[PDB]
Design a protein around this ligand. Structure first.
Ligand code: FAD
Length: 295
């Protein structure tokens, strides 16, 4: 594999007997004017949960379902690097969007686990399972060009990636490649980790490119809404050229459906080059250079 799979751990903890951590910090990272709430929370793990960049953990909300059984676990991409927000390898962090919407019947639907997580106060316990997954593991190549495409909470695994790449010192992993993050959100009030990301850009100016796409507030020169694919289109020649290099790895995380718009601009780019994007994407997936985790 071309990914950091060495010593990988999956499901050390299962629903039947999860790890019980404690909330150390819970902070809303979206503005007051934001239409929806997203929270950044840090749980203690005592160094018992051996997760790595790109993995997820399952969370079992407190309470019971309509049948008296414990709630089914919900997966959340880990937003912290392996060393964690405190650099001590004894915590794990999540980036959670509170799911609340009204169906066509006028009935409010409050997501069970997302609201449970966002309502957590420091000191409160949390049932955790995992670590989970291997689709979004980082490339082994320390000079890899890493293109990260995210929408909303999809930023989570890339915050994890970026912490290891730019906020930490690893004698065995000194990142020298080009990291490029595209983050699409509806309003600037929902620009998750804006400060952190701009700080990374400040300390690694030539190695980190950061492009925000705020669809409801920005438009390109033509006046078109700035969706993630719209922002990508501002760099079409560069991106296509990079997609042809063997050390280029593309990761996509976030709302299912963000894939279509991205494929549309890729279809155009490849075609102009006499290439069928649908086929090329299959090849990139097989060569581990196109990794997707949408929900
Ligand atoms: C690999 C993976 C990674 C994920 N990473 C994150 C992450 O980093 N952050 C994050 O906030 N979430 C993430 N999720 C989503 C998360 O797992 C839950 O699906 C989400 O938080 C809603 O769960 P809930 O318990 O709050 O809602 P539920 O109680 O499960 O939902 C209530 C009802 O709404 C429906 N429903 C569920 N989800 C949606 C939706 N998105 N839109 C409309 N209706 C819906 C259901 O069918 C259900 O009947 C991830 C999911 C996967 C599979």
């Amino acid at each position: 594999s071309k990914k950091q799979e060495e010593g990988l751990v999956t499901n050390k903890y299962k629903p039947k007997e999860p790890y019980v951590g404690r909330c150390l910090l819970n902070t809303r990272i979206t503005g007051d004017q934001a239409p929806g709430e997203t929270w950044h929370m840090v749980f203690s793990t005592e160094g018992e949960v051996p997760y790595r960049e790109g993995q997820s953990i399952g969370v079992i909300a407190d309470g019971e379902d309509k049948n008296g059984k414990p709630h089914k676990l919900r997966l959340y991409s880990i937003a912290s690097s392996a060393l964690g927000d405190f650099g001590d390898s004894k915590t794990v962090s999540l980036c959670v969007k509170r799911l609340v919407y009204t169906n066509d019947q006028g009935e409010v639907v409050k997501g069970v686990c997302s609201n449970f997580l966002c309502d957590l106060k420091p000191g409160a316990e949390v049932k955790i399972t995992g670590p989970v997954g291997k689709e979004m593991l980082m490339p082994k190549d320390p000079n890899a060009t890493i293109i990260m495409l995210a929408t909303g909470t999809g930023i989570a695994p890339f915050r994890s990636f970026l912490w290891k790449m730019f906020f930490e010192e690893h004698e065995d992993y000194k990142y020298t490649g080009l990291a490029w993050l595209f983050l699409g959100v509806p309003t600037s009030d929902t620009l998750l980790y804006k400060e952190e990301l701009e700080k990374m850009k400040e300390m690694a100016p030539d190695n980190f490119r950061l492009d925000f796409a705020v669809s409801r507030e920005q438009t390109n020169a033509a006046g078109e809404k700035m969706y993630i694919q719209t922002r990508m289109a501002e760099y079409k020649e560069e991106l296509w050229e990079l997609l042809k290099k063997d050390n280029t790895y593309v990761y996509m995380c976030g709302l299912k459906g963000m894939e279509k718009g991205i494929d549309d601009i890729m279809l155009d780019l490849a075609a102009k080059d006499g290439i069928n994007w649908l086929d090329y994407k299959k090849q990139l997936k097989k060569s581990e250079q196109w990794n997707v985790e949408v929900y």
